Every structure is written in structure tokens, then in C-alpha cells.
Amino acid sequence: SHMKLVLAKNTRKSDAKSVELEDLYHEFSEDKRSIFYFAPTNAHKDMLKAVDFFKEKGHTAYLDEVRVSTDEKDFLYELHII
């Protein structure tokens, strides 16, 4: 992976979507590892959906913001098998 990151489809929409669900299972299996999800500054919709997705599937280890949140709000710091 490119730098361990997930991009939201709402603002860019090139392929970005549903990538976390797959990174999750697969990153896990493959490697002990962590990601940053970039979901939008502009809607905050794809990001709120990320929190719901991560709960729904047990891949994770944890999720919490990056506190550049106050400045950007794009940025979820998400750790898999931490």
C-alpha cells in the first residue's frame, strides 16, 4: 500500500470506495500495521461512516482521530492488530 491510507469516495470518487473493508481483512492477515483514513473535510459523511464500519467488523485493533482534526477534520488514525 501507498502509505497505508484509505481515501473517501465523496470528494474524489476515482475508485476509493469500500477499500477499508478489504484493507482490513487483508492488511491484518498479511501484516501488523495501521492506517490513516482520509474522509472528507467537506461533508464529514464518509468519515462518520468509517467509525460505523470499523465497529461492524472485528479486523481492527482500534480507531481514534488525528488531532489535526481541529485544523482539517479529514483524518482518522486506525490501527489493525496493534
Domain that holds residue 7: 1-82
Count the domains in the chain: 1
Could you tell me whether strands 5-7 and 33-38 are parallel, antiparallel, or unpaired per DSSP bridges? parallel
Using the structure block, give the residue that is written with the C-alpha cell 462518520.
48
Q: Alpha helices, DSSP H only, in the chain? A: 19-30, 45-56
Nearest-5° angle of CA 16, CA 75, CA 35? 65
**Eight-class DSSP state of 1:** -
